Structure 1
Amino acid sequence: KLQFALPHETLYSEVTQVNLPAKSGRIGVLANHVPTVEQLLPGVVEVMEGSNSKKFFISGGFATVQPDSQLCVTAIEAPLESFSENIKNLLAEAKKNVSSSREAAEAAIQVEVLENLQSV
């Protein structure tokens, strides 16, 4: 039973397959999956409960299948449809930011976000 949650709001905290992007590549969780902890990277997340599928765009967090088969997904903020050009313009500005430079890391993260966005 999926527990998908954000501090902002709970999302699912039944659900058949959840597809997650993790530092261990991509992890898909289906029924009994051995209990894991995974760092969620900035991500595109798909949740399928039955064949109905809900698509979430996720800002990274932590994922933990619990040993009671409870998939705790916790992340800072999210739907994919809600996230879904102006941002591409911003990201261009962010490329400019890399030139001068925590700002360096920020601009690098903006490039990661550009990839994450490109995935959409």
Structure 2
Amino acid sequence: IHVSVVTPDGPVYEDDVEMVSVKAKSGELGILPGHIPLVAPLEISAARLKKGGKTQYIAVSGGFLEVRPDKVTILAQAAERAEDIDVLRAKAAKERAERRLQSQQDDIDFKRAELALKRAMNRLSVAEM
């Protein structure tokens, strides 16, 4: 029935959509409810959710398809929603700069407190009773 796009970071788009037409590495696919349990490795492309009257594009990087007759499950590693494929390579570099400055910040926030603790232990070593 319903599609569920997940990521190791967290679930992205869970809705109630009856038509998905994601491209596998063999070729096109088309999924309606009552479908056979089918397994497909997804190419770097967008999945088309076009059952709510208007289409809904969701991009996958890495990408893997597990369709049940009960539900549709997409195992993705990057699941951007704007889904014009250049925006995934743009958001990857944007969050790359973000996680680089975050990894610098999480190191300096440790080292400042570590200098405070080292000087405070130095004062005990100098005091020496």
TM-score tier after normalising by the smaller chain length: 0.5 to 0.7
Structure 1: any 5+ residue segments left out of the alignment?
A: 88-120
CA separation in 2, counterparts of 1:45 and 1:63? 10
More strand by share: 1
Structure 1's 13 and 54: CA in aligned 2 closer, same or farther, altered over 3 A? closer
* TM-score in terms of structure 2 length: 0.56
Q: Report % sequence identity.
A: 25
Cα distance change on mapping 1:59 and 1:82 into 2, 3 Å: closer
List gaps (5 residues or longer) in structure 2: 91-129
2:5 is the counterpart of 1:4: yes
1:41 alignment partner in structure 2: 43
The answer to whether the Cα contact below 8 Å between 1:4 and 1:13 also exists between their aligned partners in 2 is no
Question: What is the match of residue 23 of structure 1?
Answer: 25
AA matched with 1:35: P
1:4 shift after superposition: 1.3
**What are the residue-to-residue correspondences of 1:54-69 with 2, within 5 Å?**
54-66=56-68, 68-69=69-70
The alpha carbon displacement at 1:7 in A equals 1.9
* Residue of structure 2 equivalent to 1:106: none
In the alignment of these two chains, the number of paired residues is 85
- C-alpha spacing 1:49/1:6, structure 2 compared with 1 (3 Å): farther
* Root mean square deviation of aligned Cα: 2.4
Alpha-carbon deviations, 1:15-72, whole Å to 9, x = none?
A: 1111111023011212221110111111121112421321112113210112x42111
Given that 1:46 and 1:54 are in contact with CA atoms closer than 8 Å, whether structure 2 keeps it comes out as yes
Match of 1:93 in 2: none
Counterpart residue type for residue 45 of structure 1? A
Larger Cα-atom Rg = 2
One-letter amino acid matched to 1:6: T
